[PDB]
Design a protein around this ligand. Structure first.
Ligand SMILES: CCn1cc(-c2cc(Cn3ccnc3C)cc3c2CCN([C@H](c2cc(C)ccn2)C2CC2)C3=O)c(C(F)(F)F)n1
Length: 302
């Protein structure tokens, strides 16, 4: 079994590299952030441009949706995060505290909290309602490349250029495990069932780790990844795949269990820095850096 993702739409509008794309949890929208300091919202199914959201004073590295699809948070080189009301485009809150670029962000599933990671080597946990920083974790000794809550919000996983992946208790901020401890760990994400962690290292390697046992279960290679932090994903709407961007301008798709490459999606003209999987349909969004600046939507039968 192999998917057959085919290109359906190319979305143009950003004037610099696109940094992150994310589907809304209700499946209706794709949000994109860019070095051009803008967030753009597009229809997830037909790619139609919906709106531009502006306000950050420097480029944006990352965006994330609340579970009810009504809020976005963005992480910017202006050292803030901003919380946006998607319907109005208005900035509801500016989250101040980080002392260097904010690189990565995520709501918890409850969406009462935001987690952020920064070039200042800290992980911060923010109250969505008030905009106040609740906790600052001295999480790493180099820039934080990823922060992600698990499926019930009780855990946070972080990764860093210091070579480490750490798992944190949300409630207390205490470190439960140092899972990886070494080249930079450029990306980390919990699996949908929370039992595994997908971890990228800047040596052409993606690894599936059993979080409870602390053991690498699978290794995925083939893609080019020596420079950039690239978003990877568990695709679960059809076959069980691993999806990643790549510095050779392709989207890579692997069989999660066999580790074989099952598809490479060709079309982008620069580094594919971001991929995202639709919540209910076999749809992938990909986005590329400044020689391309587009977002592409792909569809598969499985
Ligand atoms: C501010 C506007 N902006 C930000 C980015 C952006 C976006 C992503 C994708 N990303 C966002 C959050 N999570 C993920 C996976 C990865 C990177 C970057 C630029 C920085 N770097 C490297 C780097 C990262 C770190 C942590 C430390 C040291 N170097 C640097 C190139 C060597 C990335 O890899 C872009 C752009 F154009 F590249 F898309 N524009």
């Amino acid at each position: 079994v192999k998917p057959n993702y085919a290109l359906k739409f190319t979305l143009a509008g950003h004037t610099k590299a696109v940094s992150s794309v994310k589907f809304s949890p209700n499946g209706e929208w794709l949000a994109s952030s860019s070095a051009d300091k803008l967030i753009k919202i597009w229809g997830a199914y037909d790619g139609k441009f919906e709106k531009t959201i502006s306000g950050h004073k420097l480029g944006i590295s990352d965006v994330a949706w609340s579970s009810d699809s009504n809020l976005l948070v963005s992480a910017s080189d202006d050292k803030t995060l901003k919380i946006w009301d998607v319907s109005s485009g208005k900035c509801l809150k500016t989250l101040k505290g980080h002392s260097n670029y904010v690189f990565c962000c995520n709501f918890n599933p409850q969406s009462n909290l935001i987690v952020s990671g920064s070039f200042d080597e800290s992980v911060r946990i923010w109250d969505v309602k008030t905009g106040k920083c609740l906790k600052t974790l001295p999480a790493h000794s180099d820039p934080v490349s990823a922060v992600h809550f698990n499926r019930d919000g009780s855990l946070i996983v972080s990764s860093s250029y210091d070579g480490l992946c750490r798992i944190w208790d949300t409630a207390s901020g205490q470190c439960l495990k140092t899972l990886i401890d070494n080249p930079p760990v450029s990306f980390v994400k919990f699996s949908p069932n929370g039992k595994y962690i997908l971890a990228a290292t800047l040596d052409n390697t993606l690894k599936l780790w059993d979080y409870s046992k602390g053991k690498c279960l699978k290794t995925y290679t083939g893609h080019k990844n020596e420079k950039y932090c690239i978003f990877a994903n568990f695709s679960v709407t059809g076959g069980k795949w691993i999806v990643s961007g790549s510095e050779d301008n392709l989207v890579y798709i692997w069989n999660l269990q066999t580790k074989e490459i099952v598809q490479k999606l060709q079309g982008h003209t620069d580094v594919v820095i971001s991929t995202a999987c639709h919540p209910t349909e076999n749809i992938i969004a990909s986005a590329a850096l400044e020689n391309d600046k587009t977002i592409k939507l792909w569809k598969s039968d499985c």
